[PDB]
Amino acid sequence: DKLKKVLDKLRLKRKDISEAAETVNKVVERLLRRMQKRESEFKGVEQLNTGSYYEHVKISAPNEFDVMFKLEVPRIELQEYYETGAFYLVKFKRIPRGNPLSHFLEGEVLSATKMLSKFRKIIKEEVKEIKDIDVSVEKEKPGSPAVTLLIRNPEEISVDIILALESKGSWPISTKEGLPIQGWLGTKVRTNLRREPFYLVPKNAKDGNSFQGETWRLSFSHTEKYILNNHGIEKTCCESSGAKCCRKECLKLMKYLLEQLKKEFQELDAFCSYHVKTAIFHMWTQDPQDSQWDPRNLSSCFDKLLAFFLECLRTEKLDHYFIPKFNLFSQELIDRKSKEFLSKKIEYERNNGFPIFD
């Protein structure tokens, strides 16, 4: 059927991106070596591996990539910003030796503006020293914290570099009810996952001039990668001595559906792949059995996912999987009329054999 052909095409797409991805990894690794050799406050920076396959990355053009550089910081303190904990403020507790980041403080709070400014400056200095491949830094885009590399070898590649802080302390109290897979992968696996650090990525809120450049959101890219690659109740699920399921195939179909609709209808700009991943996480929790995801029944499983999403559209409610009070479908994030538009598009595609996949 059309769906299997689409899967084949999606899979064949990795070949056209593999060489660019390799050049990107080469450049990034050179940059990391440079950053680790020089003496500065970013000496401990490292690449966070978040996956490079179509399933792991956000929707992107085939020659656009993103990487996260993680940094270590001692004993931070988090102050909630909203009522749902969508944003967080970072402050510092007692340090005996003296805070090495003292001169980046603004009042009691760490200034993201200063850190990104220094990060960008350092990147510009080191990228100037890469002599064998033409790598420069794109002019800073006001409103985007990424430092964007432009690589010309000889075709133009864009790499958005996002600085991410890493904290080894306790997980925030808001996430107490998050990750409800106690019945899906057992309690011990949940505990082992919750015994791991968490990440903070700079993000401005859309709430006035005050505190702009001083707000951060949580990142759990490691746990999500782990769950994606270890997703069965059976230890051998999707392994070489186990049986395949269609969980990732369904994810790919819905992500590609959204990608094509967003391409066709710029009305859909405010939707992203994170909504799809959250929805499918909820479905994987509701239907934990591998037999509820047989590849033979891929299309039927996809349809049962579609119906849930339409109801998610209709109630304007989609709780963040890690932060239950964080409603991804709030009025403020996505206008009701955009969701009604998406509903109409989804019903059209479902009733006409998905012509947008053509």
């Binding site: 007692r94 005996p96 107490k176």
Partner: protein
């Protein structure tokens, strides 16, 4: 049966705010109880001696602040002093 008073419940409450999923074994409860008692004793004794040197006869917040500034070594003094001042202000406001 005479029946005693300790600091078990309060220490447990404070623990449930900075590590929302760990427990604590009874031996550690005994240790923390004794530690709280000892610090309270040291601070109160120092405050009493201070109030007696200046011929005063009362303990205001100011003597407690000076005693804390004398015992705790280093930056702990600064942090604890700030915490105390904030708490007493928030109490007096209402």
């Amino acid at each position: 049966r005479s029946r005693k008073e300790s600091y078990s419940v309060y220490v447990y409450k404070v623990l449930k705010q900075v590590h929302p999923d760990t427990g604590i074994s009874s031996k550690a409860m005994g240790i923390m109880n004794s530690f709280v008692n000892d610090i309270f004793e040291r601070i109160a004794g120092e405050a009493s001696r201070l109030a007696h040197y200046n011929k005063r006869s009362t303990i205001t917040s100011r003597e407690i602040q000076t005693a804390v500034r004398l015992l705790l070594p280093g930056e702990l003094a600064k942090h604890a002093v700030s915490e105390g001042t904030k708490a007493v202000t928030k109490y007096t406001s209402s």
